[PDB]
């Protein structure tokens, strides 16, 4: 992607 900053909060959850 040419936007990002965050790659989710869901990745906190494994």
């Avoid at 992607?1 to 494994?14: D, L, P, V």
């Amino acid at each position: 992607g040419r936007k990002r900053r965050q790659a989710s909060m869901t990745e906190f959850y494994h």
